[PDB]
């Protein structure tokens, strides 16, 4: 993928293939993401059917079609403002203890002889933490993951119709049946002027949408640090914070996102007409030579590091601070308890939008 990205950044930064437009450079990728007035996120019919949702004419529908992720202003802020401080520095600080204790416990279940860290650590951590933060109970652990997988899948394909399967129905039932136990943020959404469908969509987004991406950040970090033999230096120079950002830039959990033009727009040397879909390749922008010197090289102490892995503009990842914290703690604690790491087997998640691992089997030394 990266040799292709490179060639495109050089010859066709903004390329039209007759179906959609694709952007590969940092400059333009950032331009699209920030210019919400001309590059819309309204790709799931949220704005068009908002009215029939609010007045109740629409009763059965896909909740995830209606979240802030696929809304433009002013609806966007009306939604985001309700949870904009859900991961406040003060709240996160209080959670560090929970996250650390949790991480320590997950690490204790690992059999050093041979075990899958995606299963034992990368997958569990985010679920346990978001569950704690939102107040929604972890019961059937396999179902939680199933929901994590399906939601991430759908979010990567905005506008593509998919009927509510059994699993999704169980997800919806679960949320409906546990809203009462929800915390502050959840109560604010439940007691708002949003239609039921929206409340369900909003809760699903907060509770499940960030699990697979954070899991991938953790998995990708382990892989990179190991591939490039950086563990020793990271511990020694305390590059955790910087090295995790390099991991976000070098191996982004989300490879790209989507936008639609609302009007004729000039992007680079190209002119894009109205109603066109624009695939923004975050993964490619993150390696742009202009912005990141020696961009194809992993530099653990790279700084500053303005990667676009959390996006940019009004939709900048609401969960960025939490994802960063969980990743930092998982990596920090992992490096301390384990002396050496040997990767025995790996299996990648077959997906174009999400970049991570389904299995990461390793052999470790303690102390
Ligand atoms: C390392 C993991 C993560 C990555 C790389 C990631 C990436 C992103 C990106 C690129 C966007 C913007 C997409 C666009 O502009 O179309 C975004 C939006 C968002 N993310 Fe994440 N995310 C991560 C973790 C999380 C977590 C932990 C949560 C929540 C528990 C979360 C919640 C959200 C929400 C709600 C939005 C919508 C923001 C808005 O539309 O205003 N993310 N994320
Ligand atoms: C596809 C695209 C984005 C996401 C996401 C962003 N933040 C949390 N999940 C998940 C799947
Ligand atoms: Zn229950």
Curated annotation (Swiss-Prot):
Cofactor binding mode and count: Binds 1 heme group per subunit.
Temperature section of the record: Optimum temperature is about 75 degrees Celsius. Activity is 10-fold greater at 75 degrees Celsius than that measured at 25 degrees Celsius. Thermostable up to 85 degrees Celsius. Thermal denaturation midpoint (Tm) is 91 degrees Celsius.
Keyword Heme applies: yes
Enzyme class: oxidoreductase
Signal peptide span: none
GO terms for MF: heme binding; iron ion binding; lactoperoxidase activity; monooxygenase activity; oxidoreductase activity, acting on paired donors, with incorporation or reduction of molecular oxygen
Any single GO CC term annotated in Swiss-Prot or TrEMBL for this entry: cytoplasm
Binding site for heme: 76, 80, 257, 259, 315, 317
Effect of residue 214 to A: 2.7-fold increase in styrene epoxidation activity. No effect on thermostability
NCBIfam families from the UniProt entry: Cyp119_Thmprot
Protein name in UniProt: Cytochrome P450 119
